[model samples]
Target chain A: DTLSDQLRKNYYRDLSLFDPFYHYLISTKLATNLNTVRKLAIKDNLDDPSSDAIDRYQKNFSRLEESVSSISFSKASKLQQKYDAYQESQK
Target chain B: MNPQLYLCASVFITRGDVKSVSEIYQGLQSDAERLQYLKLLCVMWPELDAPTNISFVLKDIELNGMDESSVLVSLIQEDSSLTAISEMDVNTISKRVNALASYVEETLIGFNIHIRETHMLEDFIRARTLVVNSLSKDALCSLELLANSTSKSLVSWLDGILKPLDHLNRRLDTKLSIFQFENLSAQDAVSEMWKLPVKEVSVVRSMMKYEVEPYLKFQGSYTPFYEVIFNPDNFPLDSINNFQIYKYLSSQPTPLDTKFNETKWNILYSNGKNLASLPNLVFELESLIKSFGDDSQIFSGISLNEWLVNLKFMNAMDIKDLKSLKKLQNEDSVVQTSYFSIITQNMFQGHIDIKTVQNVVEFITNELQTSILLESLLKLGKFDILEQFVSTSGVKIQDKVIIQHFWRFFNIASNGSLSDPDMKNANRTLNLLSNKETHSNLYDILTIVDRLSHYSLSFKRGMPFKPAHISEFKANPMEIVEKLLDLNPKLRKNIEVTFDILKELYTALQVTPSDKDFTKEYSKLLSEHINNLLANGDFKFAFDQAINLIERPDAAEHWVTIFQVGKYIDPNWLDAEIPTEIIYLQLGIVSKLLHICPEKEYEVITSQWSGLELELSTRNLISDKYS
Candidate 1:
C-alpha cells in the first residue's frame, strides 16, 4: 500500500511535468504538418488537410492500437483456440 | 436859244405828219451827213420855230432818199437844247441805252456789286468778271462820288459818253477784252469806234490779269484788305525776350543765351525778371527750374542771391525756405537744426543772400514759434493763413525729411541709434518725442496734446509710419491711451490723427475689461467723427479699419465694439468682402479665446458658432458632392 501510494505520487508528479511537454510535442508536429499541407494545398490548388485527420491518426497510434492488443484472458482463450486452428492450417 | 418854244412848235407840227416825216427820213442819202446838215439848220433858225414849217422841210429833205437830216431836225426841235441829250441823232441809240440800263438794273436786283462769292470757279473767269464788271459796290460808290463833283454841263457830257460805253461793255466778253480797254474810259471818242464782234473786244483784259493772279494766291478766306496792307510786323520778335520764349527755345534743348557766356541760368533769371506779371514770372521760374537739365555748372557762375532778389524770386524763395525749415524741424530737430545751420552757412557763403535767407528764416521761426493749435483753438489764425500755413507745418517737415532722405538716408540712418534715417523714422521719432514728456498741468497737457496731435497728423502722412508699429506700441498702452484722451478737442477734429494713435494702441494690447472701458471712452471721444462719417454715408474706411483690427488676436473685444458701432450706425457696413485671411485669423482668435474662456460669455458666441459649423459642414458636403 505504501509502495503503491509512493508510485502513484511519483506518477502524478511526472505526469504534471510531462503533460505540457507532451502537448508541446503533439502541437509542434501538428503545426508543422498543417504548415506543410497549407503550402502543398496552395502549390497544388487544393483545400488544406483537415484537423480531424491529425486527431484520428494520433488516437489510433497512441491509444487505440495498445488497447486492442491487451484484451482480457477469457476473451483471449476463445481467441487462442481460434488462433491455433489458424496456425495448424498454415502448417 | 429858246429850246422850249422850238420843242413846243415842233411837237405841234409833227403831231399830224408822222408818216410823211418817216418817209422823208428814209429817203436820206447817208445818216451821218444828214445829221450834220440838221444840226446846222437848227442853230440858224432859232426865231422861225414852227412844227408845220419844220415838218414840210423834213418831208422835202427825205424825198432826196433816206436822209438823217430830217430825223436830227425833228429830234432837236422835240427835245431841244438839253445838254444831257445824246449827240448821236440815231433813234436806235436812245432805245439801246434804255435797254442796257434796264438789263443792268434787272441783273443787279438781287445781286450786290461786291464779288463776295467763294472763288470756286476758275481764277481766270472769276477775276475777269470781277475786274471788268467793276463788281465791288465800294468801288462803284467811289465812282459815283467822283461823277457828282463835276459841273452840270460836264456831267451831262460824261453821262452821254458813259451810257454808250456801259451798254457796249456789258454786252462784250470781259475775259477777251480786259487788256484792250485797260486805260480806256467813257470820255474817249466814240465816232471812230467800229462795231466789232463781241468775241474780238478785249477791254479790261489787263484788269483780268491783276485780279486773277490775286485770286489764284488767295488764302482760304478773305481778310480785310486793309489788315494785310497795314501790318508790317512779322513773327513775334518782341515775345522772344519774354519768358514765354524759353518755352519755345527750351523745347529744342539748346539754350538761347549760349553767346552770353553766362549759361542758361542767366537767360532764365533775366527772362524771369522781364516777365510782365508776377504770377507769370513765378510760373516761368518754376518751369525753368524743372527744365534745368543736368548742367549745374550753368548756375556755378550765377549768383542765386542776386537772381532771387532781382527776379523777385525772393517771395518764392522765402516761401520755399520757410517750407524747408518747417519740414526740417518736423522731420528731426537735429536734422532741422543741421539744415538751418547749413542754410545759414550757405547764406553767409553767398549761395543765398543774407537778406533773403534772414527773411526766410525769420518767417520759418515765427511760424514754428506760433502754436498752430492755439491759433486754431484761440481763433487767432486767419482762415486763409491757417489753410496755407498750419496744415503745411507737418507737411513741410515731411517734405524736408523726404527730400533729405532721398539724398542722405544711407548716411543719416547709420548715425542715429533709432536708425530713423528716412521720413518714416522722423515721423516715429516725432511721435515718440511728443509722448516722452509728461504734462503735469492741464495747460501743459492741452499744449502738449495739441502739438502731439498735430505731430501725429503730420507724421502719419509725412513719415513712412507702418501699421505694424501699432503692435510695437502695445508695450505702452497706458501712455498712448492717456495721450489720446488728453488730446485737445480742437486737435481731435482731425480724426485721422486720433484714429491713427488709437489704432496703434488698440492693435498693440489685448482687450480686457479695462480696455473695453477705454474703448468705450475712445468710441465716445470719436463719436462725432463716426457719426459724421455715417451721416455722410461713407463708412468704407472705418469699416475697413475695423475689419483689420478684428483680425488681430488681441483685438477680439474691440471687434465686437466695432461691429456694434457699425451695426448701430450703418448696417450696410458689413455687407462687403472682408479679406479671407482676416476672417480666418478672427475665427482662429475666437476659437482660442473660447478655449481659454470656455465658460465665459464665449458660450453665447459658440452657440452662434454651432450654427456656423453646421452651415460650414453643409457647404463642405455640398461642395464635395458637386466636385
Candidate 2:
C-alpha cells in the first residue's frame, strides 16, 4: 500500500508539473477521489477520524487537495512564465 | 527444410544454362541466365506459398552484393517465362510475397548471423507459410485487429513491417485507378481527398497513433518483417484546442434546476473576453439598459461606470462640460440676479469671451422677435417679418405702449382677424425691403434679384406672375446692385463689375433671328465678357453664373424649345446644302452643352435621341441637302 502510494507520487513527480497534460491528469484524479469520498459519506454516518469510513475519506481528500493545488498553482506560474518569455523573445 | 531449395535448383538446372555451383554463380552474373533460373524456380515450387523461401533465393543474389539494375536486367534477359509471369498481376499476389521474403532475409542477416543453412532455410519456409496463409485466408480480420489493437507495442511491430509496402501499393493503386477512372484525374482525387471532414481525419490520426506504431516495431525486431504500417500524420496542437473549445462551448447542461457544473463554468470563464466580443452581448446589454429606464439604473453595474471613468480620465478636459440650464436656477437666486448667469458661466470657463457671449444673447433675442413676427407674416402669407422688425424696433415706444401693442396684435392674429391694417402695413414694409436699395442684406438682395429675373422672363413669355404685388415691384439694375451692396458692403465693387457681365447677357438675349451677322458678333461679345471675368480673378463667380443658368427651369427648357424651333429662325437650317464637316461641328457644340448640363436634364435631352435617330433614318437627315 505504501509502495503504491510512492509509485503514484513518483508518477506525478516525473511529469512536468506545469504541463497542461499533467494538469488534466491531476484534475481527473482529484475528481475521482472526490467522487469516492462522496460515495463513502453517503453509505455511512461515521464522522470519527479513526473510523474506516473516515480514514478512507481523509486519504481521498488529501489526494484530491494535493492534485488540485499542484495543478492550479503550477498552471498559473507556467502561464506567467510563457507570457514573459514571449515578450522577451519579441524584444 | 532445404527441400524447397533442391526443388528450385532442380527446376532451374533443367530449364537454365548452369550445371555446377561455379557455373550457377557465373550464370547468375548474366541477367539472361538469372531470369530463366527465377522462372523455373517459381514454376516448379508452385506449392511453396511462403515468402521466406522465395526470400532465400533473393538472399543468394544479394549476398553477392550485386547491382540492382544488373539483377533486374539479368532477370528479364534470362527467361521469357519470367516475362510471361510478369504480365500476370504481380501486385494482386506476388508483391506481398516479395515484401515478406525481403523482410525475412533482412531480419535473419541482421539478427541470427550464425544461423545454420538448414535451420535458417526451415525457419524462412515456416515464416513464409504463416504469412502467405494469413494473407490468403481472413486478411480483413487481421487488418481489423491490427487497426484496433490496444497494445502500443504490438501496433508498433505491425507498423514497422507493413508501412513501406502499404505505401508503395497505395501509390501504384492510385496511379492505376486514376487512369481507369476516365474524366476523373489524380489531381481531382487529391482535391476530393483534401475535402474529407477534419473530424474523420482526426479520428484516423488518433487511431494510427494508438494502434499502428507498436505493431511495426514488434514485427521489425524479429526476422526482418518488411511489411510497413502507415501512420496517419500528426496534426498541430492548435487544431485540437479549437475542436475542444468548440465542443465545450456548444454543450448544454442536462436536467432542470441543476446548478451549473465546473465544466460549464470553466468553459464560460475561459472565453469571457471572447464572449464579450460578440455582437449579441452588446445587444443584450443595450436591451438591459433600456429596461432600467433611468440613468442611475442604466449605470447600476459599477464596471460600466469604471470604463466611463477611464475614458474620461484619458481624454480629461476634452470631455464635454454640458450642464442643464435648469441647474443654474435652483430657486436659490434673488430677482436682482442678472439674466446673464448661463452666458457668464461659459465665459469664465474660458470657452467663450465676453463680447462673443453678448453677441450670442443679442442674436437669440433678435431671433425670438423675428420668429414671432415671421409666424404672424406667414399667417397672412403676403407680409414680411424683416420689414416689420425694422419698422417696429425703431426709437419711439414707451414700455406700456409696446405691451399694449403686442397684446392687441397677438389677440387679433390668434382670433382670426384676416383684414387687419397691421397686416396691410406688414405687406407694404416687406415690399419696401424688396424694392428699396437701402433695406436689403446681400443674401436678401440676391434672392430678390433671382425672383425678379424669373418674373421678368415669365412676363416676356406672356406668363405673368400670379401674385400681382410681386410683379408690381420690378427691381431696376441700380436698385438690385445697391441692395446687394447694402447686404454685404464688401460686395459693392463686385456688384459694379457684375453690371458689365449682365450687359453681355442682355445683348445675347436681345439678338434677333434676322441679324445673321449679329449671331457671331454676339457670341464674340459674350466670350469677351467671360474672358474679362476670368482675367479679373472672378472665375468662381462666372462658374456660379454658368451653373445657375444651366439649373434654371426656363434655361433648361429653352434648349429643348430651341431644338424644336429648328428651321423657324432660318428655313434653310435643315435644308441648306451644308458639308458633313459643318454638320458635325454643330452637332459637337450641342453635345458639349448637353455634357455640361445636370444629369436629370441631360437624361431628358438624351431621351430625344431615339426620335432624332428615326428622323435621321426616314428623312436621310445624315446629309444637310434634304429637309
Candidate 3:
C-alpha cells in the first residue's frame, strides 16, 4: 500500500495519456496486483503467466470471503501456467 | 369622476355606514319609505358591485309581496336623488367648474402635452385619461340635469355650465389639428426654403427623371417623397476636375453669400475690413479633392492650358494654389511644356533686368519648391539664366530661397559632363555661392565645388574649359579635394558635416569616377569619419555607415576600402562592445565579400570575428550553425 500510494502520488501525477482514475490504478493498484501475481506464479515455477492473471486475482483475492470459499488446490498450478504464458507473450 | 365627490361617496359607503342605513331600514313603517331607502342605497354605491350590498333588502321586499319594486326604476325615478345631483346653485355651479378647471390646469402645468405628438408617453397618457374621465363624468351630470329639467332658470344654469365643457373639448381637438397641420405644411416650406448643394447635379437629375419618375407612375400614389427622391441604387459619382475646382474656389469671395443677408451686408459695409470680423470658414473642400474622378472641365469657356499660360486668378492665390498647379503640371504634359516655356520667356524674353529676373525667380520659387525640380529643370538646359540672377542681384543671393534654388540648379548642371560654356557658367555661379552663408549646410554644394575644382584645374593644366579637353587632362584629385576643403572648412572640422560630405562624394564618384588620386584620399576621409564617430563612442553609427558603404555601387571596391579603414583605426573597430545581431550583420557583409576581394583580406576579417564570437560563447549561434 505504501509503494502503490507513493507511485500514484509521485510517478503518474502529470501523465496525460490516460485520465486520472484509470492512470492512478495503472500506477498503484495495477502495479501491486502484478507484483503479487508474479510472486504467486514464481512459487510454483510456472511455464508462463497468462494475460488473464490480473482478472483471476481480481475475481479470487479481491474479496476475502469468496477467496477462502473457492479454494481449489489444483487451480494453483493452472494459474501458474497461465501466468507463465502471459510473461512469455509480453516478451 | 371628480376626486372630491369620489372621496365623499367613499366615506359614506363604508361597511359600518351601510350597516346603519340598513338599521334605519328595518324601522321604516311603510313600503314607500323602505323603497326610498333602497333608492338611497343604490345611488350611494352605484359604480360598485350592488347585488351583494342590497341582497338583504331584496329578500325583505320579496317577503312583503312587493311585485314591482325594481332597484333600477326606483333609482331613476327618485326625485330626491335627482335633486341632490342638481342642487348646485348658479354661484356654486361656477365654483365647482372653476375648481375642476384649476385642478386640471395645475396638473398640466409642466407637461409638454401636444395633442397628436408626444415626446413623453407617460405625460401624454396621464393628460388624455384625465381629460377623458373628467369630461365624461361632468358631461353625464349636465346631460342628466338638462334632459329632466322643467324650470327655465334651471335650464339656463345647465346651459351655462355645459358651455365650458364644450369649450374644453374644442380646445383639446384644436391642439391636435394644429400639431398635424404644422408637420404637414412645414414639409413644403422646408423643401423650398433651403436646398443643399448637390454632389453631382447631372447624375442626380438623370436618376430623378428616369428611374424615380417611371417607378412612381407605375407604383401610384402615397409613396414617401424622401425615399423616392434619394434612392441610392446604383447612383453615379461626383465629377472630379481639380483645376476647375481650384477655379471655382478662387471665384468665390470670403464671408460667403449664403452666410449674409441684406441687413448683415449693410452692417458689414459700415464695419469695413479692418474692424472686428466673423470667424473663417471650414468646408468639405479637402475630402472633395481627395475623392477621385476623371479630369474634365467644369466651367464652359476656359481650358487648363489656357489658365496656365494666361495666369488668370493666379495673383490672389496662396501656396495651396501653387500646390494644385504642381498637381496640374504632373497630370498634363501639355501644361508641363507650356509652363516651363512661360518661365523661360518671362525671364529672358528681350532685355533681362534685375526686377524682371526677381519676378521670374519669385514665380519659379512658388512652383519649384515641389519635389522632382531637378529632373524637370534639366530639360530647360539653360543654366545661364540662374547664373545671371545671382550675378547681378546683390541682396537676392542672400535670400535663403534663391540660394536653395541655385544650390539645386548648380548641382544638376554639374551632374553630367558639361560643355565649355556650361562648365564656366557653373564655375562662376558656384564660386559666388560658396562665400554665402545661406548655402553653408547644403551637401550638394560640395558636388558642384568638386567639379569646379576640376574645371579650374583644367585651365591651369593648359587645357581649355571643355568636356573634351578636360577628359583628356588627368588632373590630381588630391588638389581638387584640397581646394574643396579649403573653400568649406566645415567639411573637416564638424564630424557631423564630414560624414555627410563623405557619403555624397562617394555616391557621386561611384556614378562617374573622379581621378584615382582623389579616390585614395576620399577613402582616407571615409576612414577619418569612422574613427571620429568611434572616438565619440558612436560604434553603432560607425557600423551603420560602413554597412551603407558596402551596399553602394562598385561595392567590392568599397568593401576593400572598409576593410582597410577598419585595419588602420586604433583599438580596432571589430573589438568594440557590440550586440550579437550587429555582429551577425557584419558577418553577412563578410560572406558577400568572400570571393569578390582577396582571400588574405577575407581570412583576416573572418578570423577576427571568430575570436569575438568565441568570447561571447553564443549557444544559439553554435546550434544553428551545425543544424
Candidate 4:
C-alpha cells in the first residue's frame, strides 16, 4: 500500500492525530505494552489527552471482557492507589 | 574372510587352545585372550560343520579355488545362497561369526576394516589377500609390539595403501630415468634432422595437409614445379605464398628452435634478398618443382613471364629478351629463373659468351664436381655454350642419377653423345661410384711417366701400361714415351685422359692409400681390378668380385661383366671365397646377373653359387632365374 494511504488508515480519532503519545502507539510494539501504557497513563503528568486516551482504552477493555468472562482482573489496592495518584497529576 | 584364517583357527582349537568356538567370541574380552584366538585362527576353519565344520567347509572351497563361506554369501546374493552357503544353521553361523569377531577384539588390538571410498572389488580382493599372505611370512619383518600392532593395523592400512599401489600397477607410463631412441642410426638420423633452421619438412607437412599421396613420393630432384608451382594463370598465388622457395637455396642453416624473425618475411622479401638452408630439403623442393613443372604451371602460380617479371624487379638488371627467357625455360622453374637468370642478366651482361662460360667450367674442379654444380645450375637452352665450356674446362662428373641424366643435360656438352649409359647400356660412372674396395696391386707402373702416351690404349685393352728407363736418369725421355706407345699395336695417344684414368694410374703407384686419395682411387680400381682379373680370365675372382659388387651401386655392371666371363673359366674357380658381407651386398642386380649368364655355365657359376643363393633366400631375394 502507499505510505499515505497506510498513514491515513492508521489514525482514526481526530484528537489523536498529532499527539506524540498516540503517534507512536499504533506503529509500535512495546516491551511492556499493557504495563508500560498503564504506567504512561499513571505518569501521564505530562499530558491530559493521553490520560483521556487511557481512560477510553480501559472502558473498551471492560466491554470486551463482558463478552468473554472466562478471564478477569482487579488492580491490587496498592497499584490502583499508585496509578490513581499518578493520573491525577496529569489531570 | 580368509578361509585360511578360519582353517588356522580350527587347528588352534584342535591344539586345545580354545576347547570350542565361544571362547573366540566374547572370549576376546581380554587382550591376551584376543591374540590367542587370532593366532589360532591363522590356521583352522570348521570352527563346526559347529564353529567346527567351518574348517572342513573352508578347506573344500580352498581346494576348489574359492573360499566356501563367501561363495555361499555371494551366490546367496545370486539366489539373492539359503538362497546363503547351506542355509547355514544359527549356532554354526554364530560360531563362524564369533571367530570373525575374535580377530577384531581388544586383547588382539581391535581393528575396524576401513576400506577406501573409491576402491573397487578386485582391488580389495587382491590387496587383502596380498597383505594377509605377506604378514604371515615374517610379518613385515616386524617387532614384538609392532607385530602385534602391524597385524592389527593392516585392517586400517590397506585403504590408504592399495589405491596407490593399484595406481602404480595400472599407470600406462613406466618409471624410467630417460626416454631412448630405437637404434644408433635411427637416433642419429632424427637428431640430425631435428632442431634446424630452415625446417622445410614442416612446409612439406603443410603441403601434405591438402594434397594426398604420390606427392610425397618426390624423388628429390628438379623438373616438376611448373605444373604445381610456377603456373600463375591457373594456380592461386596464395597457395604457394607461404612457401618462399628461392630462399631455400641460400638460407643459412641456422641453429635450432630458432625463433622466426617477423622481419625476415617482410624485410627480406621487400629487399629481394634470399636466405637458403637445408641441403637435403633442397632435393625435396627440386623434385616438387620437377614433376608436372610445365604441365601444371597454372597450379604453381609461376610461368616464364612471371619469373621474368620477378627477376627484372628483384635484381633490377637488363636481362635476356622475353623470347630467349621462354626458350631458356624448359622443365626446371627455379634453377634458371632464380640463379640462372640472375647470373646471365646481371653478371654476363644479358648474354653469356662461349669464352666466359668455358672459364667458369674450368674454374670448377673435376667433372664430378662439375656435374654436381651443373645438375643444380644448368637449364635446357644453355647447353651449346655450356658444352663449349666443359670441353675446354676439363670438368669431372660422378653420381649415377646425375650421370644417367648426362645427355638429358648436365653434360652432352663435355663428355659428348657417347654417354656411358649408351656406350654399353650401362653407366660406367655408376659402376665406379658403387665399388670402393678393390685390390690395387699393379704397382711398378710408377716412375714411368712416359706411359701417359698410350695409357688410354693400355687401359681399354687391360695391358701392362708402362715401361720406364733407368729410374728416369733419362737422356731419352722420348725413349720411355716411345717404349710405352710401341709396346702394343692397339696403342694410340691422341685424346687426353679424364681424372678417372689419372686416378687409376695413382692407384697402381700407391698400392696402399690414404683417405684423401680413396674416393678417386676406390672408383678407379673398382673397374680396373675387374678388367685385369677378367682380362686374365681369372673366373674365381670374378664371382668373388661379383659378391663384392652387391651393395655398391655401380659395381654390378663390372661384376656382371665378371659373371659373363664365368663363360671363360674352368673347374679351378670353384673354390672362390664368399664372405657373409657378400650376402649383404646381394640385390636385384645380382638377380639380374643370374639371368644374364647362360645356364650351361651353371656347373661352375651356378652350383658354386648355391651357397650364395641360400644367403640370398634368407634375405628374401627370391629369383625366377636361379631355380
RMSD values, in order shown: 63.0, 37.1, 39.4, 41.9
Worst 10 residues of 4 chain B by lDDT: B175-184
Local lDDT at B29 for model 1 = 68
* Whole-model lDDT per candidate: 0.35, 0.35, 0.38, 0.34
Query: TM-score of chain A for each candidate?
Result: 0.29, 0.39, 0.25, 0.25
**If both were scored by lDDT, which would come out higher, candidate 3 or candidate 4?**
3
Query: How many residue pairs collide in each prediction?
Result: 21, 36, 11, 70
Model 2 regions lying over 4 Å from their true place: A1-91, B1-141, B144-150, B156-172, B175-442, B458-627
TM-score of the second chain of model 4 compared to its true counterpart:
0.16
Docking quality (DockQ) of candidate 2: 0.01
Q: How much of the real interface does each model capture, measured as fnat?
A: 0.00, 0.00, 0.00, 0.00
* Ten-residue stretch with the least lDDT total in model 3 chain A: A18-27
Off by over 4 Å in 4: A1-91, B1-281, B284-340, B343-627
Candidate 3 reaches a DockQ of 0.00
- Against the true structure, candidate 1 reaches a TM-score of 0.17
Model 3 fnat? 0.00
lDDT of 2 by residue, B501-585 (tens): 3443233233233253433333333333333343344433434343333344434433532232221122343554433433343
